[PDB]
Amino acid sequence: ERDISTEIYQAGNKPCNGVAGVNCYFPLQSYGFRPTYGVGHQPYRVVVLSFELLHAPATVCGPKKSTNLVKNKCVNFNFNGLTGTGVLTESNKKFLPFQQFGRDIADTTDAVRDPQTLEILDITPCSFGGVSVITPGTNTSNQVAV
Amino acid sequence: TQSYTNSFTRGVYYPDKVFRSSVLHSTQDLFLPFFSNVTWFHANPVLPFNDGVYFASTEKSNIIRGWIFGTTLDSKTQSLLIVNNATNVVIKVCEFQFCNDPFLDVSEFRVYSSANNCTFEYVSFKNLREFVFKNIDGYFKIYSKHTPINRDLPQGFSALEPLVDLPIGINITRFQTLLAAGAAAYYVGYLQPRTFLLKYNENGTITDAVDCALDPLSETKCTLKSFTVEKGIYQTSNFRVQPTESIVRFPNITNLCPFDEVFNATRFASVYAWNRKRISNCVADYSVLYNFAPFFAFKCYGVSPTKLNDLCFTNVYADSFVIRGNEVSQIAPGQTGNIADYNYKLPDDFTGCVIAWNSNKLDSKVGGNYNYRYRLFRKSNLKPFERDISTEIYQAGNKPCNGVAGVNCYFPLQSYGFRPTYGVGHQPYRVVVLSFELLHAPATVCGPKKSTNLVKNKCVNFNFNGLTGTGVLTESNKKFLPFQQFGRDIADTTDAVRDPQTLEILDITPCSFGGVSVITPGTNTSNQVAVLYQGVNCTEVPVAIHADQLTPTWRVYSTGSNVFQTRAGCLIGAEYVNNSYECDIPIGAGICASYQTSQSIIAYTMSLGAENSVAYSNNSIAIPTNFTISVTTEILPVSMTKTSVDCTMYICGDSTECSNLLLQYG
Amino acid sequence: QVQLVESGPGLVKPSETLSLTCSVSGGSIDNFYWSWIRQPPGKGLEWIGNIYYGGSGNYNPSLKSRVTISVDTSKNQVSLKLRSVTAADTAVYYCARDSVWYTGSYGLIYWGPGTLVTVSSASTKGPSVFPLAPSSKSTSGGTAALGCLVKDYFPEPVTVSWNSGALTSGVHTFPAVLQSSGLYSLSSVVTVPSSSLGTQTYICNVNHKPSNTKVDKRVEPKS
Amino acid sequence: PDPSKPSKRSFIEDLLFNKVTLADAGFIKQYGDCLGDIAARDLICAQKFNGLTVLPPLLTDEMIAQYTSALLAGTITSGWTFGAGAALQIPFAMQMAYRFNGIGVTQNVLYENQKLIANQFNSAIGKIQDSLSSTASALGKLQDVVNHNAQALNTLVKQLSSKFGAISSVLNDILSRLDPPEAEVQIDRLITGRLQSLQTYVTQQLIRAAEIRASANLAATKMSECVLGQSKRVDFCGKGYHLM
Amino acid sequence: SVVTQPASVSGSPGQSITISCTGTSSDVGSYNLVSWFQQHPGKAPKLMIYEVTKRPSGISNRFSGSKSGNTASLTISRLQAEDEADYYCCSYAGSSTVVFGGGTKLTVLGQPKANPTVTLFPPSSEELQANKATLVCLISDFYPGAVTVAWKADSSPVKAGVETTTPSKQSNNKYAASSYLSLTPEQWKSHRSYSCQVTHEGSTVEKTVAPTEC
Ligand SMILES: *[C@@H]1O[C@H](CO)[C@@H](O[C@@H]2O[C@H](CO)[C@@H](O)[C@H](O)[C@H]2NC(C)=O)[C@H](O)[C@H]1NC(C)=O
Ligand SMILES: *[C@@H]1O[C@H](CO)[C@@H](O)[C@H](O)[C@H]1NC(C)=O
Ligand SMILES: *[C@@H]1O[C@H](CO)[C@@H](O)[C@H](O)[C@H]1NC(C)=O
Ligand SMILES: *[C@@H]1O[C@H](CO)[C@@H](O)[C@H](O)[C@H]1NC(C)=O
Ligand SMILES: *[C@@H]1O[C@H](CO)[C@@H](O)[C@H](O)[C@H]1NC(C)=O
Ligand SMILES: *[C@@H]1O[C@H](CO)[C@@H](O)[C@H](O)[C@H]1NC(C)=O
Ligand SMILES: *[C@@H]1O[C@H](CO)[C@@H](O)[C@H](O)[C@H]1NC(C)=O
Ligand SMILES: *[C@@H]1O[C@H](CO)[C@@H](O)[C@H](O)[C@H]1NC(C)=O
Ligand SMILES: *[C@@H]1O[C@H](CO)[C@@H](O)[C@H](O)[C@H]1NC(C)=O
Ligand SMILES: *[C@@H]1O[C@H](CO)[C@@H](O)[C@H](O)[C@H]1NC(C)=O
Ligand SMILES: *[C@@H]1O[C@H](CO)[C@@H](O)[C@H](O)[C@H]1NC(C)=O
């Protein structure tokens, strides 16, 4: 919030009526800023960069060459800095124009919107499963099944 | 013309830009509460804005065109103007000088006489059109939705898709409608910070919502994360009485602490003979310490500098000396070195602040300043906060020195160089260490804080010498001895305090709170519920209708709804019946509730069964003359679901760094 | 700004119960500490007790076995009851209230005028009001002191006004005397110009609360 | 049952009730009870002020007494017949003869020693009375259950004084002495510690509840077999040949 | 009373006096909650000091409070005539209990000697119709408050039927008293005159009444 008002501040109960005096101060005060001052009293220029983060169509991006789009394969995707690994498929989800991605029960990104071609891509974990080994005792044989 | 209406379930908008389908999502945001009190205007000063605005209008001719937003609307500050032609929508934020009763001249600009410094411009059966305006952060968010109707606000449901978001950081407090003799009508409501449960269907469309604070049934629905509730009694929430006012009690101290003569000393002491000054019986305003020395920042341990004005300390100690840049890191708990071992040692549990600033201009001489000395040799390390100004000759070897310097016989003190041409690490630095004794005895050093009056027998937010809390303060019978200042409880909670100004004892009690359960038949049966306040007499049930008596904003009628007192608590909304039936919804202590015939919820004492005296005598026997073959059914669980968990996939799904870190956990 | 006025019987027989009610004007009960104090005639003050709307009730340990103090917000008053009344309880009783700046049992700030309570079985008797007419020679000096003798009444006190309270200047009401019969007698005398004896009517109003006796007596020159 | 007493319990049931002292019955606790600050129940007030409360059982003690009275009356006036179908009355001597037949002793033994058996039963009941009325430490198991639950709650309360590595164990002190960002770390440490204490309490309660449920199933089986009938199982309904 | 105060104290106008209030370590030595009340005769006590030192609004700065050890002191500077009254100290005794002091009566030396004013009233006509006779001798505005009353039938002394009040301080710091002579109508009409004599500091003033002839 910014406050560029210059109204006289009323310290006490007496109204100031726009006149400085006892318990009536001018809200702004000037810095000294002389070159002979110590480090803690010298002027410092401050720039604050505030990042709105990525929820809407991103408009500020880092320098990053974008590759082609690969579908129906296990790939490492990076959509506007959202990284992951999975299979990207054409999606039937009916995104409204303001939306940019969809989430799941575990707040996992289940679908994305391609920034260049404004289409919807479903993201699926590539493929995985449990592997058990059936074996008689090693005292009997080294032959196993999977 | 101002009529009033219920908003019904109107005013639900998409809270974010994330697609969700077939899910119930709980969101806390500025929503228009269900069945709120909206104002209906017919066709004129400016209405307030508050936290948000819900605008609505049923039309077929498009008479209402635009809106005006701002605070004063007199060209002294930026104001928002939204208009729309038959094709385009024009939004400006110029510093308009609005007329008293603006209106678009059927175009023209009679709305505003002047418009300067435009810092933003944007161009882009009845029908009910609804809009929501809210000005959070630096964005003006406008949501819109228009639906055909065949009614002020139909009892159906329709979400409001977001329409525009504007990056203007305008402060807004008032607003006004705009239209192009004619007549018009529109509805206005105000948003509040409510929690809603939204229902996203398959297509990602919000189809239903539940206002979690509307009534006990909606609270139950939000607790269960469901829109349908089975018959039973559900422990929903806790009721708590909120504090009414704030009380601050500090010692009546007027003297200002003498921090000027510490930092503004003509010459600081040597580190081996560091100066110590005691600060007591004064008010300490640390925000002025930045004006005495050009130090960059505090280094506070156990406390944060910005909080130093909110605390009271029994005593303060200012220790001042001069070291060089390399040794400033040794002024800290747990350090070792020449300064930490032989000159100045801080305890490992140090609670205070360190303020070190470069003084190369004052403490350096062209030929070298040799006034500042440090102890280089000592038999053993110093204890914390110990001073050793001895100058006895140190004996390095086995030969006694007999007060004469020589081989393996050194003078313990050595002087710093301190020449102005040295590097930053070798230049002199003045160090002031503030040690806080903390608050156990009567505090003598306190921050600048006006103390208020004393309020007893009420739920208040108290602040006794920086000890903050919320509770009821009552006069205490505890026999404090004069040296004591507060009493503790089993959980080391402050149970009693001593008022610093009037040296009396005050007991502190938690204000009032309890469990709240909701007795309900199925929502398929009725929406009528009863409320059980657990373990409370039917007099501490919070009755006052305000925003400082309850965490649940809803309030089931505590008088008309038939109250009843069970050993389980206070039951509101159930009519006690002298009959006894089988237990349907167990409330407790032999009391059950059911939904019976109009129909309502009844509470009763459960029935154990029909009494049956057996016709016993010493020569009479009952013998059966017939029988019956009974087939009964007994169900027994045998096994359950066999589940397997992939630990790495669950915790660290497709992440090598996470997997490597997980390997560390055994 | 609040005003506290005590009321109740002025005579209680021994071994009875004494009840007093303090009525509040210009304020509400709220959460203030309402305290009852008493003072025997010619002796020091003695704190009886106090109570606030929250409940409980803190009493003097020497009297807590007999004292009961309550508060009624609906009727906006404070009630004091003292059981097993003995002759030692004859005293003037006051009610006091704490302020916002001196909250607590120690807040004795806004005091009532008080109410005298006497403990005995002696009969209550309305006073005899006799017109004390000054002598003709006493009125020849320009000043006539005319009065009313309030004689043979019990118990104290009585309030004597002149012309329904209109006449206040020059009115002196002397302390009552204890006669050998146990009854009380005082003389309320007003000094007036002698010129008004034939044109102004002087009627003394003697009010005795214990018997609810109001006597109006016109005082005329000796004839 | 004794109709004289308010709660229609028997003499022995009253002795048993006096032998076990509940820490907290779960009934209504007046606000002034803990506001008085003189009460000797400071443990219960501390538990209640930190969110730990006790819910009352659904069946009051009078209802349990009525249930036991009904079971006793059925057993006395109808033998085991009331556990199968309708209660069929039978003189008690003949029922005891049935039991004697059930343990392998001919009923003429019961009929010819009826007075002796009655006297022995009365003397045994009197000795049970004296044993209950003399030895205070008789109902060890129930008191152990009550003490374990109370001790668990007291430990949960005392866990609130632990810093868990934070600067202080009081949230208000942390909030007052530190800025929000730093204070969040200490509050996180306290939250983790107290959450772990709650999880420990709940796990112990689940295990102890499983044990209590096993005991309750055993008690229900003993009620069905020992009380509603005569049991041939050895040492299931007491040592010796079970009669009733 | 646990709290002890001096019975009385005297001072002259202009000088400063001190009233002490000695309690124990549990009432005065424990809390800064000592209050000083001023009570005039026939009036409710008026709060002069609260919280040891604080003066309520409307109280002159001539009254100051202090506490040391178990003794609270009220200092009155520039004594005046109206400051002569009773002074009490109340103290919070813990456990919601307040204890009052014994009370101290201040005396101001500034009051000079004042001779008494006497007024004598004979029985009224109604009282004689009531077969009773009462003579009223009202004495006012005398200082010091010590007078002696003697009644005379003609010239002979009268001892029976005399009821005299003790002196009572008036609102003007002077004293008042009243005497009553009870006589039968026959005694009233039989004597030529009756007299009331008041002696103060050795000076006697006499008033006389006689039956009226009609
Ligand atoms: C014993 O009970 C059975 C039923 O439980 C009786 O059988 C019924 O008899 C009536 C009249 O004879 C018939 O109308 C029913 O159809 C019969 N029911 C069945 C299921 O067969 C039987 O009569 C009874 N016996 C005695 C001796 O009373
Ligand atoms: C980006 O756009 C430029 C011109 O607009 C085009 O030459 C380039 O190929 C585009 N890059 C990608 C990755 O499509
Ligand atoms: C090998 O191990 C199996 C265990 O299943 C055992 O049955 C078998 O006898 C063993 N054979 C030999 C040769 O040890
Ligand atoms: C809305 O508030 C007004 C007064 O503020 C009241 O008269 C009206 O009844 C309220 N509306 C409803 C539906 O209760
Ligand atoms: C989603 O849209 C399709 C479009 O035809 C519609 O048939 C379907 O009913 C919609 N889903 C729901 C839950 O209404
Ligand atoms: C503090 O003391 C001063 C004078 O000692 C007084 O004026 C002020 O009112 C006191 N403040 C409070 C809060 O009592
Ligand atoms: C330090 O004190 C001297 C006098 O002792 C004064 O002249 C000077 O202004 C002070 N400087 C600061 C920074 O307070
Ligand atoms: C409503 O739900 C209850 C569940 O308790 C069930 O017994 C009842 O039959 C249901 N009624 C209808 C109409 O579905
Ligand atoms: C509820 O409060 C009233 C009044 O304080 C009291 O009479 C009653 O006994 C209380 N009930 C219970 C169950 O404590
Ligand atoms: C229940 O019975 C009691 C006593 O007979 C009576 O006081 C009460 O009013 C009855 N209540 C109802 C709902 O019948
Ligand atoms: C048998 O029962 C009757 C009443 O049912 C009773 O009067 C009688 O005493 C009983 N027999 C004996 C021996 O007591």
Numbering used by the authors:
A (entry chain C): 460 to 605
B (entry chain B): 22 to 64, 76 to 138, 150 to 167, 181 to 206, 209 to 238, 255 to 671, 684 to 752
C (entry chain E): 1 to 223
D (entry chain A): 802 to 1045
E (entry chain F): 2 to 215
Provide passages from the article that reported this PDB entry.
A triad of three charged residues, K535, E554, and E583, forms the key attachment point for all these anti-SD1 mAbs.
SD1-1 showed activity against all the Omicron sublineages with NT50 titers ranging from 12 to 45 ng/ml. To determine the binding modes and details of the interaction of these potent neutralizing mAbs with S, we determined high-resolution cryo-EM structures of complexes of BA.4/5 spike with SD1-1 Fab and BA.2.12.1 spike with SD1-2 and SD1-3 Fabs. SD1-1 is an IGHV4-59 antibody and uses all the CDRs for binding with SD1. The interaction of the CDR-H3 loop is particularly extensive, with six potential hydrogen bonds formed and interaction made with three portions of the SD1 domain: the loop from N532 to K535, residue E554 and residue E583, all other CDR loops interact to a lesser extent, with CDR-L2 making the least interactions. The total interaction area is 690 Å2.
